[PDB]
């Protein structure tokens, strides 16, 4: 077998047996550990894609252990403890997301933590780190991103990930002002995708659609740094994301002269990476970014 | 030993296309 599956699993067993101690008995801050020591293990037990279903279970248990650990580090009042719980909570939710895919606790369970990382988010505003900020916001728009599309249906999760996409936006402006363009391309990513979501399963208000534009000049200015970069890979989903968020945009909320002027930028980059993925050979995105490419430019030229 | 802390995940899959 996996002896190391086996070490990791007994190792965070125990590590919820003194956490559930330690809890009992009434000491605080080495329930913080134990919390620090449960994710570790939890995250990394599953960072492959395992078929023991107790793995899972395990990796669930240790996420509740982490926010318990972070409703009672925040009424101590530590700040900074409660942004590293919730940094750990969102990834230890993502990873049991990305490896499970979908059992039915886990829905309630991310949804705790996705709240939890919009407040962190927010104080880590407060305190001014951007290093922290960026990764929180990095979380926020994973989790938010995947909830929608699985769950959809709850009133809540418009909210969460609305303020998802704003939080990555405001990041993603920061990550642009420190220099680093690998970070802000990923959260470029992660604003369209999470901008087209929300289109889609819930169709535009007022903020829906200035989200979205933002997104959208977002992707475009990345996919600009990623040409440069010389990375045909990154370009090309890129592009298919500008085209989606543009799509959705004018075929719910229609197009005034800011969104025809994004839509064409848009229109252009596809252009471009669909002849950049039939050369790499895409099969299946290179007739995607057909459809997009058509699709908008049938929309755009009805007043023609 | 012990683990490292958790990474930041995979990104999310495509979303889909408008009718």
């Not at chain 1, 793995?55 to 650990?69: N, R």
């Not at chain 1, 939710?93 to 895919?101: L, P, Q, R, S």
Request: hydrophobic share 45%.
């Amino acid at each position: 077998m996996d002896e190391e599956r086996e070490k990791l699993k007994e190792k965070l067993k125990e590590v919820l047996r003194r956490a559930k101690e330690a809890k009992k008995k009434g000491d605080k801050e080495k329930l913080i550990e134990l919390a620090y020591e449960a994710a570790a293990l939890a995250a990394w037990i599953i960072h492959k894609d395992s078929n023991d279903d107790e793995i899972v279970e395990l990796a669930k248990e240790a996420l509740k252990l982490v926010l318990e650990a972070a409703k009672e580090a925040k009424k101590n009042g530590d700040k900074e403890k409660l942004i590293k719980l919730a940094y750990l909570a969102a990834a230890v939710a993502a990873w049991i997301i990305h490896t499970d895919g979908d059992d039915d606790e886990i829905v309630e369970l991310a949804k705790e933590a996705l709240k939890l990382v919009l407040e962190a988010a927010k104080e880590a505003k407060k305190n001014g780190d951007k290093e922290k900020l960026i990764k929180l916001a990095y979380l926020a728009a994973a989790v938010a991103a995947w909830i929608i599309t699985t769950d959809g249906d709850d009133d809540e999760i418009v909210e969460l990930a609305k303020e998802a996409l704003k939080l990555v936006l405001e990041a993603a402006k920061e990550a642009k002002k420190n220099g680093d363009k690998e970070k802000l391309i990923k959260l470029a990513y992660l604003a369209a995708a999470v901008a087209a979501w929300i289109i889609h399963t819930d169709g535009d208000d007022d903020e829906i659609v200035e989200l979205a534009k933002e997104a959208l000049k977002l992707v475009l200015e990345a996919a600009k740094e990623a040409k440069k970069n010389g990375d045909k890979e990154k370009l090309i989903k890129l592009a298919y994301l500008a085209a989606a968020v543009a799509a959705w945009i004018i075929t719910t909320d229609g197009d005034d002269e800011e969104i025809v002027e994004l839509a064409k930028e848009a229109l252009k980059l596809v252009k471009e990476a669909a002849e950049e993925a039939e050369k790499q050979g895409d099969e299946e995105l290179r007739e995607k970014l057909r459809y997009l490419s058509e699709a908008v430019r049938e929309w755009i030229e009805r007043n023609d | 030993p012990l683990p490292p802390l958790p990474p930041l995940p995979p990104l999310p899959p495509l979303p889909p296309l408008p009718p």
